[PDB]
A and B are shown apart, each in its own frame.
With several copies, the nearest count.
Chain A
Amino acid sequence: DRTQTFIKDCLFTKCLEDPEKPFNENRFQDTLLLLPTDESADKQLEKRDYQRINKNSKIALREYINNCKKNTKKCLKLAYENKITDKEDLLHYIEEKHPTIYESLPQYVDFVPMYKELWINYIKELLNITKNLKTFNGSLALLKLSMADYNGALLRVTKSKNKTLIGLQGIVIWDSQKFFIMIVKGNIIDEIKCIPKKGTVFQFEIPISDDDDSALRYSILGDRFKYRSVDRAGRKFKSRRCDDMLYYIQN
């Protein structure tokens, strides 16, 4: 195949100005294609039931949040007007004098002992917290915690972009996708706390009191807590930029 190539080279030296380019940039196709370019019933029932339960639970959670947000304001204003500082006084007062408004307010005194211990036992048995601490594995424990469930957990905001969100402790009731739901207590504060996750740092401490008084210092990062696997593994991860964490080093 020398002669016909030379002939088409002489053919290109008439039209084109540099005849040897189409062969080097591979612009002369040797081939050109000529072709037109070319037990089910219960399953349905349970799927409908689950969809309905989800759609109802969402509205129920929204209405519960709204009711709590209104009741905190109302009770706090009534307490400020009522010449009352202590919580044990305001609680009993609104008990005797405001029957209905008391059925909606929550009781953190019972929210602590059930949730905290049932979460601590589960995490202790999951991370294999033993009387001895010579049987640990850091990377595997980190993988487990990334896979672990954090419903009913105590978390503290230690660092945040906002200077006011830091230092808040609370037990969560539901894990959303953008906001974080907890409950905090004070002398008269019973605020349901909705805190943003974009730009905040959390931490959770596990008590260990075999013989000495020790605790594990763990922490999570909300910014990258949204793209984690849930309850299992085997998900393709992507390096994002690892650049929007300047607030961590700044302060």
Chain B
Amino acid sequence: MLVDLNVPWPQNSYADKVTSQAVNNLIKTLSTLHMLGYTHIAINFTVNHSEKFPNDVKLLNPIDIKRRFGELMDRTGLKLYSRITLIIDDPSKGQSLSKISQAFDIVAALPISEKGLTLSTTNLDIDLLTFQYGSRLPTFLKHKSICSCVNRGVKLEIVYGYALRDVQARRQFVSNVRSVIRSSRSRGIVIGSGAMSPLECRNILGVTSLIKNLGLPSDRCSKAMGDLASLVLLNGRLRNKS
């Protein structure tokens, strides 16, 4: 079975209210993912580390899959999960994870600076590490931090969707994904599709061939993608339940 863990939600801030057109486009792209052939879908929602978190538990997730996607779930026959990434820049405006870990299922991070990587590798109860593949990487991906964050269980997430946006960022995305493959030494590599339009989603064969030509062996792609996505879903569900 295949798993997608990087479907973005059309909303950045909390003051940002959703639009019916955005929900329709999300329905279209999820239907297209299910059409190409998928079993597990995990929509992602982006938020800034500088923004104020709400003093709520019943309002942390502006998704509510049961009321919106609960009909698609039992009609077309797939599942949806909650995932949130953290755009972290510097050690400020934070120090809260025990309340965001109970609401959502998967917690990710987006470090963009020097101290961001150190703080992500130090004391963040995260599962996936995501980089800005569109633009340049912060400094340099080294083994001293990547090895240490992979040996504990945190994997590196690769977005093959950012490549299909324009023509110029393709070079940067390739130069960044190959650096990540060279630094991670091809053990903890999970892949996701960060596309918001139904025109930028592909199948397993094309993605496998792309990641194989980009530097990952055919065993690593399959095994990592499948089993690691299943395992991160499992541990997320377990930490959500208990």
Please give the distance in Å from A247's CB to the nearest CB on chain B: 11
**B239 contact set on A, CB distance < 8 A:** 242
**A45 contact set on B, CB distance < 8 A:** none
> How far is B242's CA from A40's CA once the two chains are assembled, in angstroms?
46
Q: Which residues of B are at the interface with A, using a C-beta cutoff of 8 A?
A: 151-153, 227, 230-231, 234-235, 238-239, 242
Cβ of A142 and Cβ of B242 under 8 Å apart? yes
Number of interface residues of A (CB under 8 A): 9
> How far is B234's CA from A242's CA once the two chains are assembled, in angstroms?
8
A107 contacts partner chain B, Cβ-Cβ < 8 Å? no
Cβ of B227 and Cβ of A241 under 8 Å apart? no
Q: Which residues of A are at the interface with B, using a C-beta cutoff of 8 A?
A: 142, 239, 241-243, 245-246, 248-249
A-B contact count (CB 8 A): 23
Please give the distance in Å from A168's CB to the nearest CB on chain B: 23
> Secondary structure at chain B's binding surface: helix, strand, loop or mixed?
helix
Please give the distance in Å from A45's CB to the nearest CB on chain B: 45
**A248 contact set on B, CB distance < 8 A:** 234
> How far is B187's CA from A243's CA once the two chains are assembled, in angstroms?
12
Cβ of A241 and Cβ of B153 under 8 Å apart? yes
**B152 contact set on A, CB distance < 8 A:** 239, 241
6 A-B contacts, Cβ less than 8 Å apart? A239-B152, A242-B239, A243-B231, A245-B231, A248-B234, A249-B234
Please give the distance in Å from A212's CB to the nearest CB on chain B: 24
**B230 contact set on A, CB distance < 8 A:** 246, 249
> How far is B235's CA from A149's CA once the two chains are assembled, in angstroms?
26
Q: A-B pairs with the 8 shortest C-beta distances?
A: A242-B235, A249-B230, A239-B153, A243-B231, A246-B227, A245-B234, A239-B152, A249-B234
> How far is B231's CA from A223's CA once the two chains are assembled, in angstroms?
15
> How far is B232's CA from A245's CA once the two chains are assembled, in angstroms?
11
> How far is B102's CA from A142's CA once the two chains are assembled, in angstroms?
14
**B238 contact set on A, CB distance < 8 A:** 242
Please give the distance in Å from B129's CB to the nearest CB on chain A: 15
Please give the distance in Å from A38's CB to the nearest CB on chain B: 33
> How far is B238's CA from A142's CA once the two chains are assembled, in angstroms?
12
Assuming A142-B242, A246-B227, is B234 touching A241 (CB within 8 A)? Answer: no
> How far is B205's CA from A36's CA once the two chains are assembled, in angstroms?
65
**A242 contact set on B, CB distance < 8 A:** 153, 231, 234-235, 238-239
> How far is B230's CA from A245's CA once the two chains are assembled, in angstroms?
10
> How far is B231's CA from A249's CA once the two chains are assembled, in angstroms?
8
Please give the distance in Å from A81's CB to the nearest CB on chain B: 50
**A241 contact set on B, CB distance < 8 A:** 151-153
Known A242-B238, A248-B234, A249-B234; 5 more pairs at CB < 8 Å: A242-B153, A242-B231, A245-B231, A246-B227, A246-B230
